[PDB]
Amino acid sequence: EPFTQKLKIPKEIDFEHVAKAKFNAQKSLSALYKEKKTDILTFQGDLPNPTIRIKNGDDFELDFTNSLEKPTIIHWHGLLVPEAMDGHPKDAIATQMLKEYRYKVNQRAGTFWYHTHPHGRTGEEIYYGLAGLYIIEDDNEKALNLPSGEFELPLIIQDRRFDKEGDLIYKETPQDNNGVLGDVVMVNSTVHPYKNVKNTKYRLRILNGSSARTYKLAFEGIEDFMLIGTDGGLLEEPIIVKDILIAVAERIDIIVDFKDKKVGESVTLKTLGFKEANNFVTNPAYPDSGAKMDIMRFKVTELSTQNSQIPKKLSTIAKMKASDASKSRTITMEIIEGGVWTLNKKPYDMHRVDEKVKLGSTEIWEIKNSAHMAHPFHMHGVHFQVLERTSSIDFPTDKGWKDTVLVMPLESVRIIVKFTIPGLFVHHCHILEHEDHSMMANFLVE
């Protein structure tokens, strides 16, 4: 039943209305598909999990309780917080324990998210539900007067596999240790959804929260859309694009325009495929990285007089220079034998320091990849800029602040990063199955 069900909109935990929130990671049931209540994991009882929303400079406070069978912890993905609140895998809290998160937001507006991060089990916990979105606001962005209220939409894209009953299926074959691809696409935990829209501008806040699938998103119905932000918030100026690549854990802030749409018409969000991301052979039962897949439909149901007008200066981004760095280092992304995914040919030791870095310095990290697969590389505790790629695929998201960057097979991506927060952090591929099977490491800011 294509585009039968209405898109679910997450409740907001807005830190202008909430001083301290409560999350409790617990077993739940929802009918994601086939009217089958399937076992899921939630933070406050249902899916989608709530969108946190906070101004820069406000105090974030959240009491997290773990009612789950095994230890876990929440990582606030893209946030610049003290290591003790970052949700390092070594800080997982046991069943029936409490962690009190407290930090002062101190970073520019942008589109972030949050998920649990237990060592070896992150792919599973996110697959069964423990993720949501986090939005930081600031005065710059507010003064832009971008489409807001009913015209800003969170979109969490996750591909899934369901059985005949309607229950969820995670890993099935050995090839799935290389990444779980799915044949059903959910947005905001809704299978094949539809959104009733007006024929004006909509700001879409897009997170790829899948296990593995890299999406090449296009809208069949409109001619253009506008890239205005990445992981780290607004670009300097909009970029007109016809399609857009987004890997796991990456975030995009686009503007779409329905002004030429007649009532009764539709625009369909879909992925055009990206066969180049994967040179292994995926589980045959499920479509591969090149698959064309419909994702959701926006139904144009009402005419609108809204004239908002997207500014041409969005923000300023000081473009860091290669000479500003005082050290270069190389991270190799390979598969070593036994099918263990690694960085620098080492499996993750939770207790070992793989890179030691001076607090307040600027470094060039060169990320070199092997032939087998594209990898989304993420670092905690930092935002970085993309100095350069060697492959030729056009990545307009390079033009913005980033925390996760897609590294193509045999590509070298060379990023530049200033370390502002001390402590032990992790860097890793964010393909969840690879991270779970050891593609992870620690760096120490000192």
Instruction: Report the interface residues with Cu ion, using CB under 5 A.
Output: 77, 249, 375, 380, 429, 431, 434
434 is in an annotated binding site: yes
User: Which residue's CB is nearer to Cu ion, number 51 or number 268?
Assistant: 51
User: Which residue's CB is nearer to Cu ion, number 99 or number 375?
Assistant: 375
Give least dist CB 153 to Cu ion, A: 21
User: Which residue's CB is nearer to Cu ion, number 189 or number 268?
Assistant: 189
User: Which residue's CB is nearer to Cu ion, number 201 or number 434?
Assistant: 434
Residues 207, 156: Cα–Cα separation, whole Å: 5
Report the candidate in 162, 159, 158 with the shortest Cα–Cα distance to residue 36: 162
Give the per-residue SS3 of the chain: CCCCCECCCCCEEECCCCCCEEEEEEEEEEEEECCEEEEEEECCCCCCCCEEEEECCCEEEEEEEECCCCCECEEEECCCCCHHHCCCHHHCECCCCEEEEEEECCCCCEEEEEEECCCCCHHHHHHCCCEEEEEEECHHHHHCCCCCHHHEEEEEEEEECECCCCCECCCCCHHHHHCCCCCEEEECCEECCEEEEECCEEEEEEEECCCCCCEEEEEECCCCEEEEEECCEEEEEEEEECCEEECCCCEEEEEEECCCCCCCCEEEEEECCCHHHECCCCCCCCCCCCCCEEEEEEEEEECCCCCCCCCCCCCCCCCCCHHHCCCEEEEEEEEECCCEEEECCECCCCCCCCEEECCCCEEEEEEEECCCECEEEEECCCCEEEEEECCCCCCHHHHCCECEEEECCCCEEEEEEECCCCEEEEEEECCHHHHHCCCEEEEEEC
Give least dist CB 429 to Cu ion, A: 3
17 is in an annotated binding site: no
117 is in an annotated binding site: no
User: Which residue's CB is nearer to Cu ion, number 201 or number 430?
Assistant: 430
User: Which residue's CB is nearer to Cu ion, number 81 or number 429?
Assistant: 429
Residues 267, 265: Cα–Cα separation, whole Å: 7
Alpha carbon separation from 42 to 95, 125, 167, 195, 318 (Å, rounded):
15, 10, 16, 23, 39
Give least dist CB 257 to Cu ion, A: 31
372 is in an annotated binding site: no
Give least dist CB 292 to Cu ion, A: 23
Give least dist CB 358 to Cu ion, A: 21
430 is in an annotated binding site: yes
**Omega before 48 within 30 of 0, i.e. cis:** yes
User: Which residue's CB is nearer to Cu ion, number 209 or number 287?
Assistant: 209
Please give the residue whose beta carbon sits closest to Cu ion in the complex.
429
Structure tokens at 305: 């007089």
Give least dist CB 165 to Cu ion, A: 30
437 is in an annotated binding site: no
User: Which residue's CB is nearer to Cu ion, number 10 or number 78?
Assistant: 78
Give least dist CB 309 to Cu ion, A: 34
Please check whether residue 443 is in contact with residue 357, taking contact to mean a CB–CB distance below 8 angstroms: yes
88 is in an annotated binding site: no
Give least dist CB 239 to Cu ion, A: 24
User: Which residue's CB is nearer to Cu ion, number 297 or number 375?
Assistant: 375
Give least dist CB 25 to Cu ion, A: 16
User: Which residue's CB is nearer to Cu ion, number 38 or number 72?
Assistant: 72
Please check whether residue 341 is in contact with residue 439, taking contact to mean a CB–CB distance below 8 angstroms: yes
Give least dist CB 431 to Cu ion, A: 4
Please check whether residue 245 is in contact with residue 270, taking contact to mean a CB–CB distance below 8 angstroms: no
CB count in 10 Å sphere of residue 165 = 11
Which residues does the annotation place in the binding site? 75, 77, 115, 375, 378, 380, 428-430, 434
Q: Which residues are annotated as a binding site for Cu(2+)?
A: 75, 77, 115, 375, 378, 380, 428-430, 434
